[PDB]
């Protein structure tokens, strides 16, 4: 499909932009990537142990905030040059089966 999200992934505050990347409510363990122009900005992986302890792996630095249904990335210091296509690349690890989905949008205009 086009890769278009059925919502607007962009919430506007004064400084920068909040990119909302949603995932199904049943998903327990996943990896969420933010992509600008096919290039990775942020990499977020949520896993859980046998004692229900949650580990949040985020190697590239990026201000992220998690909910039980969504993941918000926060971008700052935005000029006109950063107007581009942005994508949520979701990899589901738990529950099965393994599934990769992509939603997306255009930021400015």
């Amino acid at each position, epitope marked *: 499909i086009q890769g278009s999200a059925n919502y607007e992934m962009f919430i506007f505050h004064n400084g920068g932009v909040q990119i909302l990347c949603k995932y199904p409510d049943i998903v327990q363990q996943f990896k969420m990537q933010l992509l600008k122009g096919g290039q990775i900005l942020c990499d977020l992986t949520k*896993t859980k*142990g*046998s004692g229900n302890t949650v*580990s949040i*792996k985020s190697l590239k630095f990026c201000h992220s905030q998690l909910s039980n249904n969504s993941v918000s990335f926060f971008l700052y210091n935005l000029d006109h040059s950063h107007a581009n296509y942005y994508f949520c690349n979701l990899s589901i*690890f738990d529950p*099965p089966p393994f599934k990769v989905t992509l939603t997306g949008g255009y930021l400015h205009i």
Partner: antibody
Amino acid sequence: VQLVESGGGVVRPGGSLRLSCVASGVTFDDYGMSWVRQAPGKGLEWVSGINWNGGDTDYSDSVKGRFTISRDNAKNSLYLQMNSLRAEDTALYYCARDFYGSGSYYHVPFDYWGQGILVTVSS
Amino acid sequence: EIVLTQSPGTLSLSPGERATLSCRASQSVSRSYLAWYQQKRGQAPRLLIYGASSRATGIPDRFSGDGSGTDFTLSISRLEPEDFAVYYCHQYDMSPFTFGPGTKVDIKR
């Protein structure tokens, strides 16, 4: 990709052994690892599991006080330290990783590497 | 712990025939965390099925399966000569993760 597995052999009860699985051409931080053993002529027994950074581990009760799973991602190495060895620890030890590279050892499918490391504990 | 038994102990079939292997649990196991592995002589186990019904990457479509709660099934649509091996079911729902005793498929004569 090439996997080097070592550390096993013949040991007396009470001795020690450090098993090691080293992988060359893969990103180590993506996979949670685990150790599963097979006694001679028997089935499979899950021994231990560890997540991507080693901050989360789990053990079966049969080895909980004696074995230590660990990893060194910079060296792409997975270690099983084995102390207080018993004759019933004699087995072939396989190292395994979660199939889809989640970094978790829990509630994810696992697949096995190499041929196994033979450990024989005898007096 | 959750004890897994397998039926039958030994399966005696001819090449090209279809095979049905059964796994039963001592208590209800989540459908999402049951796997079937194949082991040939001298080889390490090989992940065939995960999530009761999802087929691992690179596994031929002749392997399928399903099940729920207490009972699960691995179906092999036609027996290739490499398939006369041992098959384990594996639960990773509740720690410790346990395996069945295994089912061997041997040549019938």
